[model samples]
Target: SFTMHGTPVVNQVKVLTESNRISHHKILAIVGTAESNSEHPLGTAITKYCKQELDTETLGTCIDFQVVPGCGISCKVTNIEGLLHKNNWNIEDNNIKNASLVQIDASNEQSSTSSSMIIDAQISNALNAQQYKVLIGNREWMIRNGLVINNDVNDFMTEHERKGRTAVLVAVDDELCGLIAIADT
Candidate 1:
């Protein structure tokens, strides 16, 4: 006889959702596509998992992508010209033709996110399209759009959070549709 194994073998982690207008898989699609715009690691992981497990397709094109805090880098670096002044190497030529150059000022100019990338989730454009208008963000974000999170949804989120899961809210046509919860293992 096979003895019971530790932690029940933990083969796969299942995703759960509560909704009235959409299926669990449908919620997964919205969340997965919406999260593609997030620059956070959690967003990255969610997008990756959804694509792999659910075979979800990416939403196409982002129009007016916006981020709260300005995610950008602006500063200076000592290039060929900068080094000459730093070392106080007063030369006869003064112009300093060679000597490995002078100084350089560098700026990591990017729209937001990383690597000069504007972070595209594609779902953002969908929300503004003529056909669909899906909202993907925090409670505040939902509220900002005049969407409500009833106790039922709240309870669902609370329970999921109690179990160490990240619950993302989604709305369609200004109504609470469902949520997407993910946990990092």
Candidate 2:
């Protein structure tokens, strides 16, 4: 697996015929992505809204990127806890701020078992369904449509999530972002 043209261009032949100890029984397909690695996942479009809602300078850039070297793929997230892993990331402080934790429980009486906590009130002015979907669906669309960024969006959403609201930031790739959940009382 290699990233070419800012996108992952897999050797389909290798994937299909390399039936050795690699892909004995694996899933393979061609799909689109909405990653920061692509073309500034949240550049002008995303930042428009994000910037207005959030502290532009403090928030850094609300981008959920992935680092893929060889067959290894890693997701990069923001906030304090995820970056405070002493040894691995060792992100320099003063870069982030006012970090706190928010615990949430998910309703698991049916199929989806979910629960998680995250740095509360971080980013600002998150995107709505239309904006989020556009970004996720076709990044090209995002470039055309663009996202809305606003300050204090995170503050408002923090309270909203505290009241059990989900869907804050657009989850770039499923397992590529932080563990954000709907906090159920």
Candidate 3:
């Protein structure tokens, strides 16, 4: 008789944060929720790891989930208060504010003449909702999306690759935040 193996396992999960703007667990929660909509094996592994490390019930709700074959998945997550409240993040201090504003402007060019009051209200709503655009994919996908993969991230990926692990990149709000290394058991 031959022994059978189950699904691939997540070997490592690392968050590349310097200023501590967001907690590692929060990043994982985002990745997990984003992956929850993916049927890929790696996605299942990541989601499982996240559930094991954090309370899956409290993770943010994912919206507009999209999957790019051979790349990864992308989604917008909202209602993340459960994850953020515990960490005490200063959302106003992050670049997410400017990013969200840029997104609004780009998508609403026809409304350029809208009243400042209306624009202000929209911006406030965006920030208050804590909607994060999360992307989980390979290095090429990250580069294609104009995300900067610094040497530290590269070194980490290389180190893991040497150990025969696949490195999956994670980006939140257009910024590269972390990587997940997985391997078949």
Quantify all predictions' global Cα lDDT against the true fold. Answer: 0.47, 0.29, 0.68
lDDT value for model 2:
0.29
**Which residue pairs collide, candidate 3?**
none
Q: What does candidate 2 score in Cα RMSD to the true structure?
A: 23.0
Best by TM-score: 3
Worst 10 residues of 2 by lDDT: 24-33
Which lDDT value does model 2 have at 61? Answer: 25
1-185 per-residue lDDT for model 1 (tens digits):
86553221111233333556555665555555555564666657666776776653534322233444322111111121121222333332323223232334645453432223233423233233333345555554666667676776677667766776455565665666655555634
Total backbone clashes of model 3?
0
Higher TM-score: candidate 1 or 2? 1
Q: What is the C-alpha RMSD of each candidate to the true structure, in Å?
A: 17.3, 23.0, 13.7
Clashes of 1: 9
Q: Write candidate 2's Cα lDDT for 120-169 as tens digits.
A: 33332222111111112211222233434334444554565456433223
Tens-digit lDDT string for candidate 3 (1-185): 66565667787777776535667867767777666664767667767778878854666464788778878878778756644343333343323222324465567654332222222323333444566777888787889998888886788788777776667798877676888888855
TM-score, prediction 1: 0.43
Give the poorly placed runs of model 1, Cα more than 4 Å off.
1-27, 56-60, 69-131, 159-165
